[PDB]
Symmetry: none
């Protein structure tokens, strides 16, 4: 609930402080206390979401996954400072964690039938795929790009899955609000080909642009009553 998230926002908020004083003072006692403090917020947030996925409260769930992403952003701002690989390699866990959790909220909407609550989740997954870029381009790491393609296709499979609800409930507009989402995916996967030059990026990006074109005026077939 609300008061349980305020503890997590506090733990997060108590960690940028330990970071900036560590950027000022150069101390490493504090990063080691910021990192270990951010990991708490990434572990105290799942304790919230897991209570809220049992109840039918997804509006609280999304306000927890939105925190877990702010921890992965945070844990990236540490690795740039320290240059370590034990903090950077923690953010790819919290980032996979917040993608494997956004899917778990989408599942909660399919039974409840809440496309506006299912679509907010897929945006969070795209914040993650757009985050792992910033980890991969900054660090130059390769194990992130392997995941950003994983997480990105893990969303294009869901925009299709969100569209199966709009078409089911006769809400033609969230479909449009989801078809245009796949455009924001296909634009992303192309960015994984431009930087990190290869063929799987261009290929997988090309598989999705057809899965965009698969989501044609098919959607327009519904509002003709």
């Amino acid at each position: 609930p609300e008061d349980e998230l305020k503890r997590v926002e506090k733990l997060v908020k108590e960690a940028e402080a330990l970071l900036i004083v560590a950027k000022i003072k150069g101390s490493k006692r504090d990063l080691e206390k910021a990192l270990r403090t951010a990991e708490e917020a990434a572990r105290e947030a799942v304790k919230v979401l897991v209570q809220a996925l049992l109840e039918g409260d997804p509006e609280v769930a999304l306000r927890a996954v939105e925190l877990v992403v702010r921890v992965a952003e945070l844990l990236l701002r540490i690795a740039k400072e320290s240059g370590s690989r034990e903090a950077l390699l923690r953010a790819l866990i919290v980032a996979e964690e917040a993608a494997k959790l956004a899917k778990m909220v989408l599942e909660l909407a399919e039974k409840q039938g809440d496309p506006e609550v299912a679509l907010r989740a897929v945006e969070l997954v795209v914040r993650v795929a757009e985050l792992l870029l910033r980890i991969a381009k900054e660090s130059g790491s390769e194990e992130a790009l392997e995941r950003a393609l994983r997480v990105a296709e893990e969303a294009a499979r869901l925009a299709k899955r969100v569209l199966e609800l709009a078409e089911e409930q006769g809400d033609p507009l969230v479909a449009k609000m989801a078809v245009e989402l796949v455009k924001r995916v296909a634009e992303l996967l192309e960015r994984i080909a431009r930087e990190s030059g290869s063929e799987e990026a261009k290929e997988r990006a090309e598989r999705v642009r057809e899965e965009a074109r698969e989501l044609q005026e098919r959607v327009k077939e519904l509002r003709e009553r």
Copy 2:
């Protein structure tokens, strides 16, 4: 209540700011924060109205739907800026939302018997049908005009329904104040034929001008005691 609406007016008021600074600076970080901030106000307003439709407080309800319309006006001023289709296609949801809600207040007046409170609602629905024009003529979109005809006839069916209360309570003047409303509807539907040239607009506009003439000095039959 009052303090709960001030939070929504705040959220709205905190979004034109993010828009004008985004029109000045050209930033897209802020539209993405304005859009996502306007959607909150469109979701925090229903949380108000839904509390107020349970109570017998329609005077507060209309002060919430009047906010939800100001969000649809807002979300149109973003699409003109960005040129996106995920913001424009959000305003047609908030606009349908504020029509499907104004009807829900009219229902609350039929049991309470408040024609002055039922007639203010139908004006809000006409602000919506007059809004979707500005979306359809500006954008050139077609899925709005399909709705503006839907929402407009969804009001002419209610002006008749408001007249069934005046005639029931012996208030001959709100009937007049509603008969002349259908004239403001029929003038609107004609505008959907002038622009967006077709026959359904002219036809449906012609069905209503007869339903205006159906609402003849029928109303005058009542105040003859």
Copy 3:
């Protein structure tokens, strides 16, 4: 109370402004904001009076009904400008409203026994019957004259009712101050026969001039102790 009326005088005062700028500029955005702003003052004034009819504060009540009449005068100055029938037909509601409310203050004086406070009310009702003339002669409407006769006889029934208090409390002079009021009524109803030529006006005006003559030196019978 006082500070609550200053909000209503403000709302009224903020509406002549929107009118004159609309007469200068010819804009119709402003009438639609003046009308909708005057209606507030006609609805925020009843919220005052209704609080004051519960308390024994009629001196505040009359300072509210005097505002509601200034709104009906206002809403007539709009219809002359726009030529609409949805503003003119709103003033006949506020005008009936301020007559159905002045009676409600007179009732408060009968229990308190305040003929000077009961007689000020009947003057307000005569300002209304004298107002609906200006609506009927200007517009040429007929539904006002049907009401001006209604409101006018709705006062001659009360001047008699005020006289039943003076005669009860041994205040021979307010009776005189009320008997001469019926003369101001009978002069009015004659004016509804001169213009709007008919027999009900002349008839009903003639029924009251006898009800004036019924209120003979009957009043003089009291101060002979």
Copy 4:
């Protein structure tokens, strides 16, 4: 107690509101909610008094019967509005109820020996006999005058009964304060002969004026020590 009466004053206070808005709006949904709301206060007040007649707290009892009379005044202001006979005929029940209850407080004072608390009760009974006049003269009903004579003699029997306490306790002045009460009764019963011309009114009024004269300087016989 105090907080239990504030609920009843609230229920009463929540009913004049429903009445004035019903006099403004002309609605009948609200009278049917005011009447049914006043009856609550007439039933929630006996729940107070009955708790207070068991305890020796008559000062609270009189503050409850004073409410039940304000409900009978209220339920008369509805019948003048609606013109119904199911509200008017409810006020004669609450009015008999508040007379059959004032006697029940007088009984509580005879054992406690509180003439100042016994005399306040008989005033409440005279407010009732003076109320049923306003029901009988306004409505023209006859079943009230049958009760006003019943309730009025039901007080003249008690002023005598109050005098039997003053004479018992050597408080010569409350006797005077009660002997002069019977004068206020005899003046009342005469009023039931003047209006509602008959002989029982004049007769019963004449039986009491002798029972006034029976209460001669008999009272003066006591303070001669």
Copy 5:
């Protein structure tokens, strides 16, 4: 205490208002609300004093009896207006009440030993005996003069009783301040012989002038150490 007396001064202060408006307007609804409002202050004042006689707070007691006398003065200004005998005969109760209470404070000083607080009480009793004159000479009533002699001797018995404390505590001056009080009593009782010509007044006035002379330089016998 202080805030509890401010409620009583308020109730008193809210009653001269109802009186002057009743002298202006001639209304009798207001006297009947002033009288019934003054009686409250005479009953809410004993609720104060009785709380303060239990505690050792006579300085608050005298500030309550001083109010109860201001109510008896008030209830005399009503009888001159109305001419009633149920208000005049209420003031002789509040006046006896404030004499039977001043004695009850004097008793509280004998145990505490406070002659300056015992002597202020006897002055209040003399304000009462000097008040009942104004009731008896104005009205011409006889039942007051029977009490003014009762209350006056009820003080001369106490000035002697106050002197038994000064002589006990070796405070020779309050004795003088009390011996000269009996002179103010004997002057009073003579006034009850001058007006209301009789022998008991002259006799009882003569019994006290010897009880003044009994209180000779007896008092001077003490300060010779």
Copy 6:
């Protein structure tokens, strides 16, 4: 404290006003309100001092006793006007009161060791002994002269007692400032022999002039280090 004394100076200041208007108008309603108003200030001043003797604030105490003396001067200006013995005999109480209180401040200085604050007190006691003369010579009373000798020796015992502090603290000059005080006492007691011719005045005045000579260059024995 300061704001609490301003209430007492106000009460005093509100009493000379009532006196001068009573000397102009000759009214006795006002003396009876001035006397009873001065007694308040003599009773509200002890409430100050008693709060200040508990704290170590003698500078405030002397600013209260200086008020109580101004009330005894005041209450003498009334007795000259009225010629009463109940006001004159009140001033000898306030005058004894302000002597029995100045001693109570001197006691507070002995523990604090403040000879300059102890000597100001003895001056106040001499203002009292010099005041009772003006009461005794004006009135011709004898019970004052019995007190002026009491109060005067009640100071010569204290000038000796003040000298025991100067000699204790090695402040040779306040001793001189106190030895010369006894000269102002011995001059006073002689004045009580010149007027009011007797032997106790001359005797007691002669006992003190030796107690002056006892306070020889004894004081000079100290400053020889």
Copy 7:
């Protein structure tokens, strides 16, 4: 604890009040209530200390014995007023009581090893020996001087005992802070020879001045490491 001492300071503070009003008014009802109220504080203070000697809280103990001494000072200010021997002879009990208790705190410090807390106690015992002088010189009593010598040597035995802790803990300065204490004792015992001329005072004072000289640079032998 703290809130339990505030009750004792209250009881003390409620007793100077009863004293000053008794010095003003001369009443003996109040001394008999002040004395009996001070004895409470002397008995409610031991109830505190005894709870605090069981715990290891001497900082609270000294804040209780400091109260018991303020009661012995108080009970001396009564005997000067009344002149009684049952109040004076109560202060020598509270004064012995606060010496027999200060020793009981010193014992608590020897086990805890707190010389700064042991030395504050011996100061309290010297406040007692310096108090019994003021009882003996004022009253002229002899049974106090027998105790002041008892209590004074009961401290010089403890300053030696405090020095055995400083020497044990290697805190050379509290020893100095205690050696100079014995000088404040020896100066005291000499004062018991100057006044109350005898040989035991001079003798016992001379035994201690050698026990001062016994406490030579013996103390200086320690800080030579």
Copy 8:
């Protein structure tokens, strides 16, 4: 915020005062109070910035770093006075501190995307590199020049980093406004070769003039749409 900076400007403003009076009077008590007072402002300013880097308020951050530089200027004006090395060596800490902090604001702009707010920061870093010259040329110290090269290249790395935002947001002019900044850097590093003759200055200055020439009409490639 604003009121928190006014405390820091006050602390600064309270330190030039202590300096000028120390230059007048020659006192060293005041430098030791000015230095220790300037260090507060350098420590109370980071407490501001650190609160403002958490919020998105860089406009306040730059108004704090601008203070910290005014303290380093101040702490240089002390070392010229005293000639000490503990004040001069404090200014190189506050100067490094205000460079390590300006970078921390630039980081805040990269996420917000505010090139005008990122470029103001790099100017502050150049005020620092231009300050350490005045420390190095005045004092002749070498440990400053080692830092001025550190801080100067720590800016040329950021002007490039600012240009990566302009090129990202399509703001071609702030790039120009940053390319010309590197010219102000390269001119500076040359000044570190002219004075303090060496090769690293000339070398590092030459590495940057090529990094200026690297920032060619590359910038002009963008505004060709």
Copy 9:
């Protein structure tokens, strides 16, 4: 915390007052209340610091030790007045106390790694060694000089210990800011040889000037990367 220090600054601030009035008036009641009041502040300050050494709040600790030094300065200004040895010998305890406490804050910085917070502590210890001079030169005492050498070497051992942190964290400048501190120590110990002529002062001062020279450009070895 802050509000807990304001109580200690109050206790201190309430003691200079008692001193100046004691220098004016010459009273010894007040020194005995100032001394005993300063000792409170020296004992209420450790209660703060001890709470703050448990938390990681050294910024509050230094604001407490800075108070305890202001008490040792205060307790020296008393001994000059009284000439006592029980106040002077209390200041050497508070002065050792504030040195044994500054070390306890330095310990808190070694675990936190805060050289700027560790160096402020050693300055406080040098304020103490510079204070005991003013005690030793003024009084001429020898037991202070034994401590000033103890406290002074107790700092030169810590400046070395502070340098072990700078060298550990790569902060070359606080080392300089600490190396120059030992110069301020060696200058001090020489002052203990100039006055108080001996060889241990010159010797120990000479041991430290070599420990200054031990802290050579050793520090310069670090910033060569």
